[PDB]
Amino acid sequence: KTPIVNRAITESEVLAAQKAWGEALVAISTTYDAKGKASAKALAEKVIDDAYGYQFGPVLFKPTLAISPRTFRTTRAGALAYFVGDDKAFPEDKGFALSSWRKVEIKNAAIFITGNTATTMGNVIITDKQGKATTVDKTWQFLKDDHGKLRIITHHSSLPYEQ
Amino acid sequence: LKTPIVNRAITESEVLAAQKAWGEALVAISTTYDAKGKASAKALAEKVIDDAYGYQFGPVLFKPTLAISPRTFRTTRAGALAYFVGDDKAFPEDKGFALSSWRKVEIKNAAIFITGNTATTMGNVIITDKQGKATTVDKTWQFLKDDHGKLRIITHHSSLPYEQ
Amino acid sequence: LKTPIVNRAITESEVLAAQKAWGEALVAISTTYDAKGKASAKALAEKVIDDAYGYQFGPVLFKPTLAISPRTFRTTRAGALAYFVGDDKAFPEDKGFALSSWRKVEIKNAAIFITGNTATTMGNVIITDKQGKATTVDKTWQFLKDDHGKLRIITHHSSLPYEQ
Amino acid sequence: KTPIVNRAITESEVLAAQKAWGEALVAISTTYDAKGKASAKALAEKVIDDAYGYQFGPVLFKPTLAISPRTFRTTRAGALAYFVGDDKAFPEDKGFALSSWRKVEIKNAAIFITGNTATTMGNVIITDKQGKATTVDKTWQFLKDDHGKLRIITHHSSLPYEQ
C-alpha cells in the first residue's frame, strides 16, 4: 500500500475529540471527589497540555462561567484556574470541574471541516452525581498537530439566552 | 516581471477589515430601518448575509447573542435574516436584533488564530445605539477566504457576558 | 437526522479517483483524434483542461514531460492546451502530446501527502499507445478541492526518468 | 497588540526557505571540499532533519540525478544517500552535494500559497567552483510546522527536456 500522510481531520476524529474532552472533564471531577484538590489540579494540568493547544500560543477560550474582567483564558494558567481554581490571579474561580460531573452528552448542530482544522457548534449537556443537568451552547475548533492529534485552539461556551 | 502568485492564505489586515465590515453592515442595516423602515432594512440585510456569511457552502455555525433556546442555531440563510430583521413566522420570537438603532461597533480582540485558508477571532464587540446604550458581547468569528479571495463567516458564536 | 456537515478536506479515494480521471481524459483525447481528427480532440482537450486543471484560480504550476526549454512552464490555459494538442503558433515546438494514440494509463504512487484542502501525489505514470509502446514518467500532482468539492490540478510536474 | 497565531505562509517565508536550501546544499559541498566525507555526511544529516519533513512520514522527493530503480527518496536515508553517497543500499549514489557547489540561483515561474503549505515551480541554477552551471526544473512544497518553520514535504527536480 502507498505510504501516505493525512494532516486532514475526519468526522470520526472530531466526534472522538469531543468525547475525549467530556471524559477529561469527568476524570478531573471524580478525581477531586475521591482524592482532593492537589490530585485534580495535577490531572487537570496533563488534560490541558494534552487536549488544548497553548503550546502554539494563545487558545481562543471563553469558558461558560468566566466573569467579565477575566473572560478570555488565552494562557494555560487561565484554563487550569477556570477548571480547578487555586490561583490568586483568578480570584473569582472556585473550579468548574469540581461540581462532581459524571455524564457529558454532545449534541452537534453543525460540523465544518476546513482541512487541517474542524469547527463544531451545538449543545453540550453536563450532568453531576445527582442528575443536575447544565446545558451549554458550545463552539470547538480542533487543529490536527504535526503528530496527528486534535488540539482545541478555539472553545466558546455560553449558557442559553433566557428572557 | 514580478512572479505571478496565488494567495489563498488570510493576513491579519484582511481579518481586521472583515471584522470592521460586519460592524459597518449591522450599523448600515440599523440606520436604513430608522430612516427608510422594514422593507429597505430587509433587502439590505439580505445582500449583507449573502456577502459577509458563507451559507453558499452549506450550514453556517451561527449562535446569535439573543437567539431563544428552541431556535438557537441559525444554520440557514433564513435563520440569519430572521435574527437580524425578524418578519418570519418560522422564527416567531425574532423582533430583529439589527433594528435597535445601532450607530457604533467597537472590536476588542483577545486573540487571533490564522490556520491558513481560515482565521478565528475571539474577544469583545461593543455595539452602541443612538442614545449611547452599550451592549457588550463575547464574540467568536471564523472567516474562510473563498475561491474569489473574499472572507466569509462560516462560524459566529455571540454570548452575553456571564453575570453571577 | 444526521448532523449537516461541510467537508473541504480531500480523502485518499478522492485523490486516486482524480488521478484515474486525468488518465481517462488523456486517453479520451487521444482516441477522439485517432477517430475524429484534430478539431474534435481540441474541443475535448479544452473541456478537460477547464474541468481537471485550476487555471480559473490563476497560474497552474505545470511543467509538462516533453516541454522545450524556452516554453517550459505552462502557467496559462493556452500553454496547457497547446502542449496536449498543438495547433498554436505561440507554442511552435508543440505537435501535441495527447495525439500519440494513447490507450492505457497506469498510476504507481510512491507517496501521498494530504495537507487538508490539498493533496500531493508523487510516483510513476505509465502511458501505453495502440502498439504497446510504454512511456514511463516521474509525476508530481497537487489537487485543490474547490468551493464545489471537485479536485483541480494546481501543480503538475512530469519528467522522463534520468538516464546516466 | 492582540496575541496572534499565524500557521499561514507568506511570500517572504517561501523565498527565504528556497534560499535556505541553496545555502544548505553549498554548506555541505564546501564542507566536503575542506574537511572530507564524514564531516559532510554529519552536516547533511542535520540539514535534512532541519529543511525536510521525514518526521511527518514520507517526503515526495524525486531528486534530479536519481536512477530508475531508486527514483523516489521517501526515507531520510534515501535523501542522505542521494546527497553524500556512502550507503551500500543506494549503490548508484556518489553524492550530488559533493561536486564543489558554490552559487545557487532561484528563478520562480509561479508560487501557490494554499494557507498552511506553499508550492513553488521554476528554475534553479547550481554553479560549481569553476562556473560549471547545472540548470534544473524544480517544484518545492513547504509545510509550516507547529513551530512556525517551513519544511519540504515535496521536492521534484528534473533536467530540462532536450530533443
Residue numbers in the entry:
A (entry chain B), D (entry chain B): 43 to 205
B (entry chain A), C (entry chain A): 42 to 205
Provide the authors' original text about this structure.
In the present study, we report a novel type of CAs that has been characterized in the eukaryotic microalga Bigelowiella natans and the cyanobacterium Anabaena sp. PCC7120. Taken together, these results suggested that the COG4337 proteins are metal-free enzymes that catalyze the hydration of CO2 to HCO3-, but not the reverse reaction. Each domain formed a cone-shaped barrel structure comprising three α-helices and a four-stranded antiparallel β-sheet, which were almost identical across the COG4337 domains of Bn86287 and all2909. We thus concluded that COG4337 proteins should be treated as a new variant of ι-class CAs.
To further analyze the metal-free catalytic mechanism of COG4337 proteins, crystal structures of Bn86287 and all2909 were determined. Crystallographic analysis was performed using crystals soaked in solutions with bicarbonate and the anion inhibitor iodide; the addition of 1 mM KI led to the deactivation of the COG4337 proteins. Iodide ions have been reported as an inhibitor in several classes of CAs. The substrate (bicarbonate) and inhibitor (iodide ion) were found in a bent finger-like cavity of the cone-shaped barrel. As expected from the biochemical assays described above, electron densities corresponding to metals were not detected in the cavity. Considering that hydroxyl groups of Thr106/159/322/486 (residue numbers in all2909/1st/2nd/3rd domain of Bn86287) and Tyr124/176/339/503 were found at a distance of 2.5 to 3.5 Å from an oxygen of HCO3- and at a distance of 3.2 to 3.7 Å from an iodide ion, these hydroxyl groups would most likely mediate the deprotonation of active site water. Similarly, an iodide inhibitor was reported to be positioned 3.6 Å from the hydroxyl group of Thr199 in hCAII. The results of size exclusion chromatography with multi-angle static light scattering (SEC-MALS) system showed that Bn86287 exists as dimers but all2909 exists as tetramers in solution. Analysis with the PISA (Protein Interfaces, Surfaces and Assemblies) software estimated that a tetramer of all2909 was assembled by a head-to-head interaction of two dimeric units. Notably, Lys180 in all2909 was found at the analogous position of Tyr224/388/552 in Bn86287.
